[PDB]
Design an enzyme around this catalytic site. Structure first.
Site, PDB file in Angstrom:
ATOM      1  N   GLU A   1     -47.538 -63.457  19.770  1.00  0.00           N
ATOM      2  CA  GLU A   1     -46.086 -63.316  19.732  1.00  0.00           C
ATOM      3  C   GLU A   1     -45.519 -62.857  21.067  1.00  0.00           C
ATOM      4  O   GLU A   1     -44.478 -63.355  21.514  1.00  0.00           O
ATOM      5  CB  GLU A   1     -45.708 -62.330  18.625  1.00  0.00           C
ATOM      6  CG  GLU A   1     -44.289 -61.812  18.693  1.00  0.00           C
ATOM      7  CD  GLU A   1     -44.039 -60.687  17.698  1.00  0.00           C
ATOM      8  OE1 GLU A   1     -44.868 -60.508  16.769  1.00  0.00           O
ATOM      9  OE2 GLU A   1     -43.016 -59.981  17.845  1.00  0.00           O
TER      10      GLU A   1
ATOM     11  N   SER B   1     -36.463 -57.910  14.192  1.00  0.00           N
ATOM     12  CA  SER B   1     -36.420 -57.039  13.015  1.00  0.00           C
ATOM     13  C   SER B   1     -36.756 -55.608  13.418  1.00  0.00           C
ATOM     14  O   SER B   1     -36.045 -54.654  13.056  1.00  0.00           O
ATOM     15  CB  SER B   1     -37.414 -57.531  11.954  1.00  0.00           C
ATOM     16  OG  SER B   1     -37.277 -58.920  11.708  1.00  0.00           O
TER      17      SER B   1
ATOM     18  N   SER C   1     -40.069 -54.358  20.179  1.00  0.00           N
ATOM     19  CA  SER C   1     -41.217 -54.178  21.062  1.00  0.00           C
ATOM     20  C   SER C   1     -40.710 -54.091  22.491  1.00  0.00           C
ATOM     21  O   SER C   1     -39.793 -54.818  22.867  1.00  0.00           O
ATOM     22  CB  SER C   1     -42.219 -55.337  20.967  1.00  0.00           C
ATOM     23  OG  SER C   1     -42.904 -55.345  19.725  1.00  0.00           O
TER      24      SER C   1
HETATM   25  N1  ANP Z   1     -28.243 -65.370  10.994  1.00  0.00           N
HETATM   26  C1  ANP Z   1     -28.959 -64.178  11.017  1.00  0.00           C
HETATM   27  N2  ANP Z   1     -29.641 -63.786   9.942  1.00  0.00           N
HETATM   28  C2  ANP Z   1     -30.320 -62.652   9.994  1.00  0.00           C
HETATM   29  N3  ANP Z   1     -30.376 -61.833  11.023  1.00  0.00           N
HETATM   30  C3  ANP Z   1     -29.726 -62.172  12.131  1.00  0.00           C
HETATM   31  C4  ANP Z   1     -28.987 -63.377  12.176  1.00  0.00           C
HETATM   32  N4  ANP Z   1     -28.416 -63.486  13.396  1.00  0.00           N
HETATM   33  C5  ANP Z   1     -28.766 -62.408  14.103  1.00  0.00           C
HETATM   34  N5  ANP Z   1     -29.554 -61.599  13.355  1.00  0.00           N
HETATM   35  C6  ANP Z   1     -30.131 -60.360  13.876  1.00  0.00           C
HETATM   36  O1  ANP Z   1     -31.343 -60.740  14.527  1.00  0.00           O
HETATM   37  C7  ANP Z   1     -32.403 -59.895  14.076  1.00  0.00           C
HETATM   38  C8  ANP Z   1     -33.697 -60.712  14.078  1.00  0.00           C
HETATM   39  O2  ANP Z   1     -33.984 -61.033  15.428  1.00  0.00           O
HETATM   40  P1  ANP Z   1     -35.261 -61.940  15.771  1.00  0.00           P
HETATM   41  O3  ANP Z   1     -35.498 -61.820  17.275  1.00  0.00           O
HETATM   42  O4  ANP Z   1     -35.086 -63.368  15.281  1.00  0.00           O
HETATM   43  O5  ANP Z   1     -36.413 -61.205  14.936  1.00  0.00           O
HETATM   44  P2  ANP Z   1     -37.754 -61.710  14.235  1.00  0.00           P
HETATM   45  O6  ANP Z   1     -38.520 -62.456  15.256  1.00  0.00           O
HETATM   46  O7  ANP Z   1     -37.334 -62.534  13.027  1.00  0.00           O
HETATM   47  N6  ANP Z   1     -38.482 -60.325  13.782  1.00  0.00           N
HETATM   48  P3  ANP Z   1     -39.920 -59.773  14.464  1.00  0.00           P
HETATM   49  O8  ANP Z   1     -41.049 -60.145  13.617  1.00  0.00           O
HETATM   50  O9  ANP Z   1     -39.778 -58.216  14.391  1.00  0.00           O
HETATM   51  O10 ANP Z   1     -40.079 -60.180  15.944  1.00  0.00           O
HETATM   52  C9  ANP Z   1     -32.015 -59.438  12.673  1.00  0.00           C
HETATM   53  O11 ANP Z   1     -32.624 -58.173  12.447  1.00  0.00           O
HETATM   54  C10 ANP Z   1     -30.477 -59.279  12.806  1.00  0.00           C
HETATM   55  O12 ANP Z   1     -30.112 -58.002  13.363  1.00  0.00           O
HETATM   56  O1  N0R Z   2     -41.385 -56.297  14.909  1.00  0.00           O
HETATM   57  C1  N0R Z   2     -42.490 -56.606  15.204  1.00  0.00           C
HETATM   58  C2  N0R Z   2     -42.975 -58.055  15.235  1.00  0.00           C
HETATM   59  O2  N0R Z   2     -44.321 -58.024  15.641  1.00  0.00           O
HETATM   60  N1  N0R Z   2     -43.471 -55.617  15.561  1.00  0.00           N
HETATM   61  C3  N0R Z   2     -43.261 -54.188  15.604  1.00  0.00           C
HETATM   62  C4  N0R Z   2     -42.066 -53.631  16.044  1.00  0.00           C
HETATM   63  C5  N0R Z   2     -41.950 -52.254  16.084  1.00  0.00           C
HETATM   64  C6  N0R Z   2     -43.002 -51.452  15.695  1.00  0.00           C
HETATM   65  C7  N0R Z   2     -42.831 -49.948  15.761  1.00  0.00           C
HETATM   66  C8  N0R Z   2     -43.595 -49.406  16.967  1.00  0.00           C
HETATM   67  O3  N0R Z   2     -44.168 -50.082  17.743  1.00  0.00           O
HETATM   68  N2  N0R Z   2     -43.589 -47.989  17.132  1.00  0.00           N
HETATM   69  C9  N0R Z   2     -42.893 -47.190  16.199  1.00  0.00           C
HETATM   70  C10 N0R Z   2     -43.739 -46.028  15.724  1.00  0.00           C
HETATM   71  N3  N0R Z   2     -44.162 -45.347  16.964  1.00  0.00           N
HETATM   72  C11 N0R Z   2     -44.385 -43.950  16.984  1.00  0.00           C
HETATM   73  C12 N0R Z   2     -44.093 -43.221  15.833  1.00  0.00           C
HETATM   74  C13 N0R Z   2     -44.335 -41.842  15.914  1.00  0.00           C
HETATM   75  C14 N0R Z   2     -44.833 -41.404  17.134  1.00  0.00           C
HETATM   76 CL1  N0R Z   2     -45.169 -39.689  17.325  1.00  0.00          CL
HETATM   77  N4  N0R Z   2     -45.075 -42.165  18.150  1.00  0.00           N
HETATM   78  N5  N0R Z   2     -44.842 -43.466  18.094  1.00  0.00           N
HETATM   79  C15 N0R Z   2     -45.098 -46.217  17.707  1.00  0.00           C
HETATM   80  C16 N0R Z   2     -44.257 -47.367  18.206  1.00  0.00           C
HETATM   81  C17 N0R Z   2     -44.194 -52.004  15.270  1.00  0.00           C
HETATM   82  C18 N0R Z   2     -44.321 -53.382  15.231  1.00  0.00           C
HETATM   83 MG    MG Z   3     -39.677 -61.934  16.881  1.00  0.00          MG
END
Ligand code: ANP
Ligand code: N0R
Ligand code: MG
Ligand code: ANP
Ligand code: ANP
Ligand code: ANP
Ligand code: N0R
Ligand code: MG
Ligand code: MG
Ligand code: MG
Lengths: 352, 352
Positions: A121, A175, A178
């Protein structure tokens, strides 16, 4: 045979599709009907079913890719509707990334003889970002910033050159969030992340306001006043906290005025939407700022679809990063912010 | 004449009161009735009106302070009820800190001839923390940690020695959060803060669940399952995200499963309370971790009343700091966590 890159995220599927435009007379005669049908379907429609959308304004026209000229298209739909996509597919070498490349691996393989290749990713994000900036957005800059973000009467979107992009802090607001430190085309690290991301905005907004879409959540937030929900420094001090240079308008406690019942009873849904947006956006900006200081990187680029049609959050990030870093950090944005993983996946096709 | 230290915060007032226990026969005869009345009122009651509380278990007995022996008492009440306190006061040199020392300065001066001395909120925190740890908690350690925080069958509160406390990262979780890097008794800096603090927990919990007190919010959270509201890594990947060592149980998006209407309709108030607690606590832990890495400090002490009667958040901080820092950082806690500013204020009395 169709060239697709797919990023299956926790919320949205992003699809990049390369439409060849140099098809010869022989190729056109010797193409199978299904390939013609999929090309016509994709290029003659901008809505696909009830939830797929082609972002026509992002199209890269007359791109040279893998030695062919074509148009690069950008398509998105909810991950919740991937079963519809796969069923339509059962009516190809698919490079796929995001968590769903793994979660739905077995589902993609229900499409006969389809070859799925899973790619990382964050690798795909970096590769796609560098690629799109390198080819330009139809001759315009892919990257922009907000000039004079501290002043609203002057604050304006301006192009920004990333021709020597390294080093770079990439803040991927999906969602969840990173954060990457990119030192070269093949040298980067995931510094950290935060779970307070786009899904926190959308999930909390839905719980607090009853909004039924991301766009409705943003519309509500544009009409609201976050200070009706947030407890500010001036609510605690009566003014600035001068000894530590904290302005009275700074938020001391997000949603902190909602501990009082009478305030909960007077706050509007729009105020709550805006407080949710402000809370999530400032927290991402602050984490990004801390990571940039520790990584000794001064260019911070924000991507991901949290910022799609969300100029409020972009300007807040631009202002806040500049203000709290005393001008040492610059917030950068990209026109194809949500699609970089899908492009990076498509770019892996020659390796198979 | 009565010796008091007061920290007027954005949510709670904390009061430290030194009760002399070496009063001579001459002093007892020559004391004014009001001074006797206030001493008897404070020491014969543990509830004051409808919202004041004396935390009797925290009392320091037979402390030597300013050359007298006495008992140090710890009293708290909501800042919303400060008008009742001031009216009772109108029926003394007051060292006061927190934002309310400034916000309510003119209100304190309605008490005839009372001399108000405003002292800095974070200076007082540092001074009070160092002082209480130096005198001990009635011969026991003031500081503790959770041993083997990664294993619940072993995780247990254990005393921790802070005899050479420097350097130290102090995370003050009040309504909002301030983070201090303490290098010596008089050399410290406010590294940063976060507005996602105790008031965000309480305000969001009240909006989402209808809870009417901090203690009710915690009771709800103890019964809930945050994974009903949060979107986990395994919800996106079907498992771990192995390339970056992210476990499937890690939260990828706080409240991220609340974007689905049917999930909003099945989640319980207790689940929402626990998700709010987990979200706020992890974010504070993560910001603390980033600050400790940048400051090159490996001892992180958490204070403030967000952690009052809140073993859930303490153990989460202990586990998370150890896990995400790969054992390089240790979470520390203090028995008098909410009262350090009030003590530091009282310690300023000789300067006036
Ligand atoms: N049409 C839509 N539907 C849902 N969410 C949307 C939309 N447009 C924008 N968003 C926002 O875009 C975010 C998702 O961004 P995106 O970069 O596509 O994440 P993702 O790749 O699906 N999630 P991840 O697995 O964490 O990387 C959602 O959390 C909303 O805040
Ligand atoms: O959304 C995607 C799609 O792959 N991934 C994805 C996105 C975000 C995370 C959360 C994350 O990375 N952190 C949150 C918790 N963190 C903490 C918590 C307590 C302390 Cl003391 N220190 N660090 C470590 C860092 C995980 C995965
Ligand atoms: Mg994504
Ligand atoms: N190292 C290998 N050498 C030769 N054949 C293999 C090897 N590994 C697997 N195979 C066989 O070839 C098939 C496809 O392999 P592969 O090219 O790795 O695609 P994939 O696993 O389906 N997708 P991905 O791993 O994400 O690129 C497997 O189902 C095996 O039957
Ligand atoms: N520098 C000064 N030298 C002499 N008298 C002063 C000075 N500053 C103020 N005063 C007078 O003395 C009064 C009390 O001063 P001061 O000791 O600073 O207490 P305060 O301002 O009420 N509380 P604080 O400033 O927070 O310690 C003021 O109201 C003035 O009338
Ligand atoms: N009885 C209570 N009433 C209200 N909040 C409580 C109570 N007990 C614990 N808390 C928690 O303690 C937090 C306040 O901590 P505290 O350290 O007293 O902050 P403060 O000093 O009042 N605020 P600040 O101005 O930001 O330093 C609240 O946000 C709650 O999360
Ligand atoms: O609760 C009390 C009692 O005094 N004070 C108090 C507590 C907390 C705060 C918040 C705070 O300090 N920060 C939050 C905003 N931060 C950002 C935002 C965006 C970016 Cl890009 N960078 N940083 C700067 C740091 C303020 C005051
Ligand atoms: Mg394989
Ligand atoms: Mg405080
Ligand atoms: Mg003065």
């Amino acid at each position: 045979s169709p060239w697709f890159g797919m990023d299956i995220g926790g919320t949205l599927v992003k699809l990049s599709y390369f439409e060849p435009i140099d098809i010869t007379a022989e190729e056109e005669q010797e193409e199978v009907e299904s390939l013609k049908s999929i090309r016509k379907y994709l290029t003659s429609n901008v809505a696909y079913g009830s939830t797929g959308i082609r972002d026509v304004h992002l199209e890269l026209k007359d791109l040279t890719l893998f030695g062919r000229r074509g148009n690069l298209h950008f398509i998105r739909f909810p991950t919740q509707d991937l079963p519809t996509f796969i069923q339509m597919g059962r009516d190809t070498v698919l490079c796929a990334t995001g968590g769903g490349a793994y979660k739905f691996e077995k589902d993609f393989r229900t499409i006969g003889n389809l070859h799925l290749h899973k790619l990382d990713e964050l690798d795909c994000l970096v590769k796609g970002l560098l690629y799109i900036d390198s080819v330009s957005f139809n001759g315009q800059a892919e990257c922009y910033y907000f000039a004079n973000a501290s002043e609203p009467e002057r604050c304006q979107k301006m192009p920004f050159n990333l021709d020597d992009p390294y080093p770079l802090l990439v803040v991927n607001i999906g969602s969840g969030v990173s954060i990457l430190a990119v030192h070269s085309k093949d040298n980067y690290k995931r510094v950290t992340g935060t779970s307070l991301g786009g899904g926190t905005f959308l999930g909390l907004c839905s719980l607090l306001t009853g909004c039924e879409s991301f766009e409705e959540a943003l519309e509500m937030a544009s009409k609201g006043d976050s200070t009706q929900a947030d407890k500010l420094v001036r609510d605690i001090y009566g003014g600035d906290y001068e000894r530590f240079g904290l302005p009275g308008w700074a938020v001391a406690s997000s949603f902190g005025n909602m501990i009082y019942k009478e305030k909960r009873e007077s706050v509007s849904k729009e105020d709550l939407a805006r407080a949710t947006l402000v809370t999530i956006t400032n927290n991402i900006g602050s984490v990004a700022r801390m990571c940039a200081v520790n990584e000794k990187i001064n260019r911070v680029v924000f991507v991901g679809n949290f910022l799609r049609v969300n100029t409020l959050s972009m300007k807040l990030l631009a202002y806040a990063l500049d203000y709290w870093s005393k001008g040492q950090l610059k917030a950068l944005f990209l026109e194809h912010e949500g699609y970089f993983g899908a492009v990076g996946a498509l770019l892996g096709l020659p390796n198979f």
